[PDB]
């Protein structure tokens, strides 16, 4: 067999951040934007506690692409983008990477490389009128499909055929937007659903959002498990002589393996050396 050294301690180094991310105002909002003009909010420089997310209704969908919900408290993303809107029931399947349809093409398109989470919950008791909730509209006609995360709020009359419209609707000249008719008596596939899309991006720049993972003391010259801003690994941390430029955070080897890391708190450089190992 092959002998290896086993770790003795586990250390976590997270940024010294106290503020709590404003997920309550994103989720417990009085109104949600229309799908064609979905509301985008930037979340950064705060501690993101997702353990409270489930505290807003019995989630109908919590599909996470690239990560898992149970692990969301152990990661350190860089920027969070929260896009909130309202759609219908059967249309909720269109909010996913590599999808097609009315919402995917003309309202909200998710890139194929999407990494994040999608939340949808039924909101028939909030966004339905017995006479019809006409506050929510979706685009029905466009020249071409949308680029990922592109918002189209134009309301110009759509010209389909060769006949000019001159700004007057009618045959061959349809109004681009069509309004939802949410009612309390509609079917589940037609009832309103509130959708919040979180778009994480990892690595690169220093992480500004992090989970509620406590940071322990930093120990060097020992074979330990380490977790630097979501970067997990095993090895021995040692002082570095590297000319790490101020912006540079971590260094890579020939095999693109993290070999030097900048401590998120002390802003000091640490070389990572794999624990002694070999064959017998």
């Amino acid at each position, epitope marked *: 067999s092959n002998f290896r050294v086993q770790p003795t301690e586990s250390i976590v180094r997270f940024p010294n951040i106290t503020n709590l991310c404003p997920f309550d105002e994103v989720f417990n909002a009085t*109104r949600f934007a229309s799908v064609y003009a979905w509301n985008r909010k930037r979340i950064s420089n705060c501690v993101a506690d997702y353990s409270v997310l489930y505290n807003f209704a019995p989630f109908f969908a919590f599909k996470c692409y690239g990560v898992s919900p149970t692990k969301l408290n152990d990661l350190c993303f860089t920027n969070v983008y929260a896009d909130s809107f309202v759609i219908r029931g059967n249309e909720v399947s269109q909010i996913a990477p590599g999808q097609t349809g009315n919402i995917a093409d003309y309202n909200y398109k998710l890139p194929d490389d999407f990494t994040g989470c999608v939340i949808a919950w039924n909101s028939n008791k909030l966004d339905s009128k*017995v*006479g019809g909730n006409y506050n929510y509209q979706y685009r029905l006609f466009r020249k071409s499909n949308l680029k990922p995360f592109e918002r189209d709020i134009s309301t110009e009359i759509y010209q389909a055929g060769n006949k000019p419209c001159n700004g007057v609707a009618g045959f061959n000249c349809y109004f681009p937007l069509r309004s939802y008719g949410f009612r309390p008596t509609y079917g589940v596939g037609h009832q309103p659903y509130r959708v919040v899309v979180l778009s994480f991006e990892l690595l690169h720049a220093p992480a500004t959002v992090c989970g509620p993972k406590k940071s322990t003391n930093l120990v060097k010259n020992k074979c330990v498990n380490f977790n630097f801003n979501g970067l997990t690994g095993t090895g021995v941390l040692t002082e570095s002589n590297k000319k790490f430029l101020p912006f540079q955070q971590f260094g890579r080897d020939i095999a693109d393996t993290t070999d030097a890391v900048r401590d998120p708190q002390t802003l000091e450089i640490l070389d990572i050396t794999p624990c002694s190992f070999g064959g017998v």
Partner: antibody, heavy 128, light 107 residues
Framework: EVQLVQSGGGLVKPGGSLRLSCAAS????????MNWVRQAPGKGLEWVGR??????????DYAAPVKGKFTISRDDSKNTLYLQMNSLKTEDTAIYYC???????????????????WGQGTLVTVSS | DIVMTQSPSSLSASVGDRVTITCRAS??????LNWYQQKPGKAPKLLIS???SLQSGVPSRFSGSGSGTDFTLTISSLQPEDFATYYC?????????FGGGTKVEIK
């Protein structure tokens, strides 16, 4: 500037008919719902009816006391809204306002059933 | 139709005072409630939309809150130009009904 000039108000005998007009300017009349609201002398506001935009089907809703007597019409050509009332009684006297339900297509948070802009109001009196 | 009641209907206060107007609906109307201000001899003006959103051009001293069957309009610091009649209007149903009307006067 958004303006809603009204005309056609006046006095009428019981059982008569008048044709109120409300000409809109300064905004896209096509995309805005138009509602009629009346205020009895010394009383609170009462809702008369509503006509939706042509892009939403143009269905017309009326209050219970005025369902079978009033008729709300619109013409996008001259950006004008019309309220036709017939078979009046002594209880229909009030100051009638024409109101709009402009929808903000840009921001996204645009209400559709809020009286954003109001006309100056015209006085309609029913007497012998 | 939905029965809609205001409370109170004769409240008065002086300048630099806090005023709260309560508006109760006969059934759950979610957030479809609007607050209007009518000065004597003038057309009404929209103040609060969706029962929690300030309208553009309205001073920040007007605030809306509540949901379900209870709504409240709060004026933090009353002003000489804030004496008027306030109406709460529901849009949950197709038959829109206004409130009873609250008159805010001076002492």
């Amino acid at each position: 500037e958004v303006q809603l000039v009204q005309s056609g108000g006046g006095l009428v005998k019981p059982g008569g008919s008048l044709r109120l007009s409300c000409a809109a300017s300064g905004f896209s009349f096509t995309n805005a719902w138009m509602n009629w609201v009346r205020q009895a002398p010394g009383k609170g506001l009462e809702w008369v009816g509503r006509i939706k935009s042509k892009a939403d089907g143009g269905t017309t809703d009326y209050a219970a006391p005025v369902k079978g007597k009033f008729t709300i019409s619109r013409d996008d050509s001259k950006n004008t809204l019309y309220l036709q009332m017939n078979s009046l009684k002594t209880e229909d006297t009030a100051i009638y306002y024409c109101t709009s339900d402009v929808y903000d297509f840009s921001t996204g948070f645009g209400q559709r059933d809020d009286f954003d802009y109001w006309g100056q109001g015209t006085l309609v009196t029913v007497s012998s | 139709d939905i029965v809609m009641t205001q409370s109170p209907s004769s409240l008065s206060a002086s300048v630099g005072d806090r005023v709260t107007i309560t508006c109760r609906a006969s059934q759950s109307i979610s957030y479809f409630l609007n607050w209007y201000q009518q000065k004597p001899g003038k057309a009404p003006k929209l103040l609060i939309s969706a029962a929690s959103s300030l309208q553009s051009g309205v001073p920040s001293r007007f605030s809306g809150s509540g949901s379900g069957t209870d709504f409240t309009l709060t004026i933090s610091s009353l002003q000489p130009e804030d004496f008027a009649t306030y109406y709460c209007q529901q849009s949950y149903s197709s038959l829109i009904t206004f409130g009873g009307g609250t008159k805010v006067e001076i002492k």
